[PDB]
Design a protein around this ligand. Structure first.
Ligand SMILES: CCCCCCCC/C=C\CCCCCCCC(=O)O[C@@H](COC(=O)CCCCCCCCCCCCCCC)COP(=O)([O-])OCC[N+](C)(C)C
Ligand SMILES: CCCCCCC/C=C/CCCCCCCCC(=O)OC[C@H](CO)OC(=O)CCCCCCCC/C=C/CCCCCCC
Ligand SMILES: CC(C)CCC[C@@H](C)[C@H]1CC[C@H]2[C@@H]3CC=C4C[C@@H](OC(=O)CCC(=O)O)CC[C@]4(C)[C@H]3CC[C@]12C
Ligand SMILES: CC(C)CCC[C@@H](C)[C@H]1CC[C@H]2[C@@H]3CC=C4C[C@@H](OC(=O)CCC(=O)O)CC[C@]4(C)[C@H]3CC[C@]12C
Ligand SMILES: [Ca+2]
Lengths: 147, 99
């Protein structure tokens, strides 16, 4: 997205015809896997430091609190994205087993899972994906403080 | 400014001006790291909203750089943050990060 996204936020592009659009949006990439592993490792190191020294010894350090803060938000963003991914997966599983209507255009899906075919505009203001990228941007800004 | 040192009135001024330019280079490097932090962070937040913003401020990396740089001189509006959609959570994060 360095030069921007070609697709408008109002149009859903699905690679294969029967794909739930939210499945494609919320699925993890290989870079996402490495970032989660990196955050897990950094969070693991921070926990060991806290465990061996205790709360008061660990809580009175500017870097230690900030590192815990940025790792808490990083874990918070990833948990929100996984929750969004799980909801999309539930819709996808229902689609491929209960719908046989050739690319999900003519068929009317139940409103509980029909919501998972909408573009960015029709998303709820409090759905996990929007919360995920809202918190993820904060963690990215907080990362460069460790420079 | 090459021939300026030869003057008694303007000589000391040009020498002191060069001293501050060297001095602020170190401080400018520190601000570059801060500048690059918000440029990446706010671009990530607003990259998905190309046609859903009042202006194209933080949509791309180049435009995110332009919006943040001109905010130094107060030449960037606060409408850079406002979104067309009702995603108030993302919009308010942009308000806080820009603030
Ligand atoms: C403990 C850690 C993890 C915590 C996870 C918690 C998850 C909770 C998240 C979501 C849970 C669900 C929330 C409800 C849904 C949204 C509600 C809403 O409407 O949004 C509201 C705004 O919301 C905010 O203002 C958030 C502000 C966060 C500030 C972060 C500062 C980071 C500083 C970084 C400094 C970097 C410095 C770098 C170095 C210089 C807007 O509402 P409204 O428009 O007023 O409503 C009008 C009606
Ligand atoms: C003050 C504390 C209470 C207010 C902060 C919470 C804001 C609540 C919120 O969610 O709304 C933001 C608002 C739209 O609702 O929009 C805005 O205008 C707000 C944009 C500015 C928000 C406050 C910015 C504080 C600056 C802090 C700086 C930390 C020190 C600097 C780091 C120095 C390191 C070199
Ligand atoms: C030291 C570590 C383990 C701290 C990590 C804390 C997280 C595991 C918890 C704390 C707050 C929780 C979050 C609180 C707010 C939300 C909003 C929530 O949005 C909704 O699901 C409501 C909309 C809907 O789906 O119907 C998504 C989960 C999430 C991110 C929660 C996910 C789990 C979080 C991040
Ligand atoms: C007014 C407009 C039309 C032209 C302005 C151009 C100036 C910015 C340049 C043109 C000639 C330059 C001057 C050429 C001659 C001198 C004398 C030179 O040495 C002296 O002051 C005399 C004593 C000594 O040489 O020891 C110092 C630079 C100075 C003032 C230069 C300063 C900068 C000047 C005025
Ligand atoms: Ca530490």
């Amino acid at each position: 997205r360095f030069e921007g996204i070609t697709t408008l936020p109002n149009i859903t592009v699905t690679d294969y015809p029967k794909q739930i659009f939210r499945v494609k949006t919320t699925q993890f990439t290989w870079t996402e896997m490495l970032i989660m592993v990196w955050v897990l490792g950094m969070m693991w190191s921070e926990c060991k430091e806290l465990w061996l020294e205790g709360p008061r010894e660990y809580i009175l350090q500017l870097w230690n609190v900030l590192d815990f803060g940025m790792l808490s938000i990083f874990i918070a963003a990833f948990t929100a994205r996984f929750l969004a991914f799980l909801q999309a997966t539930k819709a996808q599983q229902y689609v491929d087993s209960y719908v046989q209507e050739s690319d999900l255009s003519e068929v009317t899906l139940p409103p509980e899972i029909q919501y998972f075919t909408y573009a960015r505009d029709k998303w709820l203001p409090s759905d996990p994906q929007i919360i995920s990228e809202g918190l993820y941007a904060i963690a990215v800004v907080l990362s460069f403080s460790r420079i | 400014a090459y021939i300026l040192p030869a003057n008694e009135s303007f000589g000391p001024l040009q020498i002191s001006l060069g001293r501050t330019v060297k001095d602020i280079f170190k401080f400018m490097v520190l601000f570059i790291m801060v500048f690059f932090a918000f440029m990446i962070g706010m671009f990530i937040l607003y990259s998905y909203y190309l046609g859903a913003k009042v202006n194209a401020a933080f949509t791309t990396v180049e435009e995110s750089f332009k919006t943040l740089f001109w905010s130094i001189f107060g030449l960037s509006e606060v409408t850079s943050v406002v979104l067309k959609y009702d995603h108030k959570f993302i919009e308010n994060i942009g308000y806080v990060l820009y603030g």
